[PDB]
Amino acid sequence: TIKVFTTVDNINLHTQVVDMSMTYGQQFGPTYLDGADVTKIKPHNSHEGKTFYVLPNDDTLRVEAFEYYHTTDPSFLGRYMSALNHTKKWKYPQVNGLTSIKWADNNCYLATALLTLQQIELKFNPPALQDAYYRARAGEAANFCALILAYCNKTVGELGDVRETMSYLFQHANLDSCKRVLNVVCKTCGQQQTTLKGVEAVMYMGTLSYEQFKKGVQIPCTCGKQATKYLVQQESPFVMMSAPPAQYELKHGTFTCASEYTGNYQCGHYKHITSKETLYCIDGALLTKSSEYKGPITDVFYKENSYTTTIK
Numbered sequence: 001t002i003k004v005f006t007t008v009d010n011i012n013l014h015t016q017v018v019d020m021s022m023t024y025g026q027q028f029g030p031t032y033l034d035g036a037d038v039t040k041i042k043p044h045n046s047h048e049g050k051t052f053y054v055l056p057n058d059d060t061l062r063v064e065a066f067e068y069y070h071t072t073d074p075s076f077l078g079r080y081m082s083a084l085n086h087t088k089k090w091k092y093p094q095v096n097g098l099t100s101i102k103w104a105d106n107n108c109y110l111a112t113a114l115l116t117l118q119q120i121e122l123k124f125n126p127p128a129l130q131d132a133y134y135r136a137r138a139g140e141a142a143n144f145c146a147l148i149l150a151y152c153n154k155t156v157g158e159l160g161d162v163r164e165t166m167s168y169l170f171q172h173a174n175l176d177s178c179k180r181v182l183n184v185v186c187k188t189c190g191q192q193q194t195t196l197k198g199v200e201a202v203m204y205m206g207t208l209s210y211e212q213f214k215k216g217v218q219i220p221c222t223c224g225k226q227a228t229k230y231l232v233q234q235e236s237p238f239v240m241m242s243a244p245p246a247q248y249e250l251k252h253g254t255f256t257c258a259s260e261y262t263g264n265y266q267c268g269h270y271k272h273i274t275s276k277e278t279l280y281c282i283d284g285a286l287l288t289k290s291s292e293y294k295g296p297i298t299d300v301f302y303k304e305n306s307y308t309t310t311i312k
């Protein structure tokens, strides 16, 4: 009868004395080792004193699991562990000082997201995500990638979108201070100012150009006509500007990083462009550099702190 530890968070460990003549499943319910489902398996001898993840089956474990993951979804742990079983076999090469991912299991959108997350200021609310984000920044990204899959409700090999992935992660981040003030000018209706907070204050869909957003973009007015929307005030450490992919020129020093998407809707591949002392293009493990870039861009990230318009 070996001594093991059970946990939902790998911080609070609970000593258990297990029966060597019963499965982990019979004694604990769903039980995992480093991602590997061992519910239907007897305790070996080299399992002695090791840490097992369990599905929460008492109040203490349910509270610990919510405090760590910020979800009570009973499927979360099994989806996280199933993802981790693959993400632990991925390769996380250091490319131009950034942790990337070698191509596997349609993971280009995760590699692009992971590269982006290393270049923008973001604090995650769930300790599971914040802890794994620090570990990923230091080169140990397998756990973080499995969490991103579980929080986005995506499995390994499923096709993914960087913008949708960033949106889910931002909904799990402290963006409460982020504020965006917009003005809409219609010939007829006149001027209406609106204030957005959190995720809606940092994401925009319809133009890649932060400068064009400051000048004004044409949107339909509920009245019928076309109106100009422009940015009045921005308080955030970054903005994400997205549009359906189109040929776009990226200028060294005018943006932080960008998502390149080649191919048809739900049938293409991401590469990541980052502005350093020159432009670096990261394609999983592969790196190329050039002074200029023109290609199909769908996301551009920019630095911000505080912007106020000069438009009266």
Ligand SMILES: Cc1c(N)cccc1C(=O)N[C@H](C)c1cccc2ccccc12
Pocket: 159, 160, 161, 164, 243, 244, 245, 261, 263, 264, 265, 266, 267, 268, 298
């Ligand atoms: C949306 C999506 C999902 N859900 C999953 C995987 C890929 C994409 C996608 O095509 N995204 C790209 C960036 C994209 C997003 C939006 C519009 C697009 C139009 C033409 C071609 C690609 C477009």
Ligand SMILES: [Cl-]
Pocket: 006, 007, 008, 009, 010, 011, 012, 013, 061, 064
């Ligand atoms: Cl625990």
Ligand SMILES: [Cl-]
Pocket: 070, 071
């Ligand atoms: Cl929450």
Ligand SMILES: [Cl-]
Pocket: 103, 104, 105, 106, 107, 108, 109, 269
């Ligand atoms: Cl891929």
Ligand SMILES: [Cl-]
Pocket: 070, 125, 126, 171, 172, 173
């Ligand atoms: Cl959260």
Ligand SMILES: [Zn+2]
Pocket: 070, 125, 126, 172
């Ligand atoms: Zn939360």
Ligand SMILES: [Zn+2]
Pocket: 086, 087, 089, 104, 105, 156
């Ligand atoms: Zn795999």
Ligand SMILES: [Zn+2]
Pocket: 186, 187, 188, 189, 190, 221, 222, 223, 224, 225, 227
């Ligand atoms: Zn109008």
Ligand SMILES: [Zn+2]
Pocket: 106, 107, 108, 109, 268, 269, 270
């Ligand atoms: Zn791909």
